[PDB]
A paper describes a structure:
At variance with what was observed for AFhHFt, the structure of AFhsFt presented a single gold binding site. A gold atom with 0.20 occupancy binds the SG atom of Cys126; a water molecule completes the metal coordination sphere, giving rise to a linear geometry. In the structure of AFhsFt, a gold atom is bound to Cys126, buried at the interface between two hsFt subunits. The gold binding site close to Cys126 is not surprising since it has been already observed in the X-ray structures of other gold-encapsulated hsFts. ICP-AES data indicated that about 270 gold atoms were encapsulated within AFhsFt, achieving a protein chain to metallodrug molar ratio of ~1:11, while only about 90 atoms of gold were found in the nanocage based on the human H-chain Ft, with a protein chain to metallodrug molar ratio of ~1:4. In the case of AFhsFt, the comparison between the structural data and the ICP-AES results (one gold binding site in the X-ray structure and 11 AF molecules per hsFt chain suggested via ICP-AES data) demonstrated that a significant fraction of AF is not directly bound to the protein, but it is encapsulated in the bulk of the hsFt nanocage. Considering that 270 molecules of AF are encapsulated within hsFt and just one gold binding site has been identified on the AFhsFt structure, it can be concluded that many loaded AF molecules are trapped within the bulk. This suggests that AFhsFt has a high number of AF molecules that can be released from its bulk and that it preserves the features of the native protein and thus its ability to be recognized by the Scara5 receptor.
Auranofin (AF), a gold(I) compound that is currently used for the treatment of rheumatoid arthritis and is in clinical trials for its promising anticancer activity, was encapsulated within the human H-chain and the horse spleen ferritin nanocages using the alkaline disassembly/reassembly protocol. Mammalian Fts are composed of two different chains, the H-chain (heavy) and the L-chain (light), that assemble to form a hollow cage-like structure with an internal diameter of 8 nm and an external one of 12 nm. In particular, two different ferritins were selected for this kind of study: the human H-chain ferritin (hHFt) and the horse spleen ferritin (hsFt), which is mainly L-chain. In fact, in both AFhsFt and AFhHFt structures, the gold atoms are found close to the side chains of cysteine residues.
Numbering used by the authors:
A (entry chain AAA), B (entry chain AAA), C (entry chain AAA): 1 to 171, 175
Amino acid sequence: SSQIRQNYSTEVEAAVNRLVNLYLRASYTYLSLGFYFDRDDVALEGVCHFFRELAEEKREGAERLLKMQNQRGGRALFQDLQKPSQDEWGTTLDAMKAAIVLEKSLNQALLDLHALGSAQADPHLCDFLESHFLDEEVKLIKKMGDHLTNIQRLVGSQAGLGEYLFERLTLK
Amino acid sequence: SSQIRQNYSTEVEAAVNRLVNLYLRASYTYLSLGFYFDRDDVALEGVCHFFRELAEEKREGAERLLKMQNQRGGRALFQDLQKPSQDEWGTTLDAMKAAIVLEKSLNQALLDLHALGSAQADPHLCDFLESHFLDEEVKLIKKMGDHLTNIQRLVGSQAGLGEYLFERLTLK
Amino acid sequence: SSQIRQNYSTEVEAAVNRLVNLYLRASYTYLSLGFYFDRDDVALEGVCHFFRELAEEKREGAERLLKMQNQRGGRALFQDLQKPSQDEWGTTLDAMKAAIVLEKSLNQALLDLHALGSAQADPHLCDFLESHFLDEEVKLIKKMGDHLTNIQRLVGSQAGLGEYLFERLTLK
Ligand SMILES: [Au+]
Ligand SMILES: [Au+]
Ligand SMILES: [Au+]
Ligand SMILES: [Cl-]
Ligand SMILES: [Cl-]
Ligand SMILES: [Cl-]
Ligand SMILES: [Cl-]
Ligand SMILES: [Cl-]
Ligand SMILES: [Cl-]
Ligand SMILES: [Cl-]
Ligand SMILES: [Cl-]
Ligand SMILES: [Cl-]
């Protein structure tokens, strides 16, 4: 094992590699969502921007996990990335529903890794997650929930109108 | 339950609402302490200012708890606020003793909520308390203990003299 | 006990005093390492500077522990400081190996104190260590491990050459 490794279980090391794969899969999903909203037959620029910014945040989360794996003396191991679950993402409402389902799965994976760290008595790992991940996911999920309420109140009987207005007046 | 709620127990949700009530009660107590020291027959401006600033800090603590309740998908519920325990607060020594008793009760309520979060495996809640509340209460209680030692060493056999000097030279 | 003390076990108080002694011993060891590399017959200025800066960081860690002991209402108690384990420290490789052994002992003492805090349900203590100590030790141990790999790849069959180059091009 590493010259530096101390109090770092093989179970946590493997779970960190699987979480890197989830975050990179989530980034890839957001890349697909963003380019879908840039299609000329979809054409919602603020929705495109919202998802492209999330693609960058999820890749940054993966790279912070990989930095920490090396700082603890674990060994990064990469696996195939599965393509996103859809090729076309429907309305902004459909896309925001898929986004909050994706973020709740990331949050559950973070909470499961925290529970493993707590069982392994690994307080650096618990610190790391509580400082860089758990509050970021709660805030993002709250933000998506607010958006989903506003998109839903705009459907009325003029769904196209509501979709334009949300993009223009909430997402710029 | 919320579209956003995840890993957030009904027990924690209720305990957060009760802690909001404690913090708003503490704010109300500090408002009363501050206006008492502004009476013309008490007239200790630095003591007034010390307690009025604490009234604001305790209201800010309540509003940060309420923000977090909504970020987790819980439901704020407000109850009646009881009036403070006294209408007149005696000397600066009496008032500082009542203040440290009040802050030790807030600290115990924070530690009890942390213990509930730890039993519910709610690391976002534990993070939140450890980042925004626990060190603020330890520092404030230390600061009050320092003040109580200085007020006590000033009583001597010239209590009025000591009360003036403490207000002038420690609390500006 | 203190007017301020709350949820602060005698076991944690004593363990904090022992950790202060370890940190001051580590500072003293780094003072010795730094002055050894300033000898005219050793003369590695970047190595001197590296260890003198660690002597200051370990003394600062002791003083932050002592500040927290007083903020919790415990009582600082100082013991004799043992001299460092060596009077002469060999090559930069020998010195960096002794440094990472010393930092791994500090890290284990921090993890043991965190485990005691967790058993005593002392979340302020756990917070304190996770915020000011645990990530600083992981980062430093990683940094020393990187240095040890670079020093080792420079030994070749020209050890003096490698020792000069490391000092000049990594440690300025
Ligand atoms: Au942990
Ligand atoms: Au927890
Ligand atoms: Au703890
Ligand atoms: Cl544009
Ligand atoms: Cl697939
Ligand atoms: Cl407008
Ligand atoms: Cl004035
Ligand atoms: Cl009442
Ligand atoms: Cl003066
Ligand atoms: Cl020089
Ligand atoms: Cl000795
Ligand atoms: Cl050069």
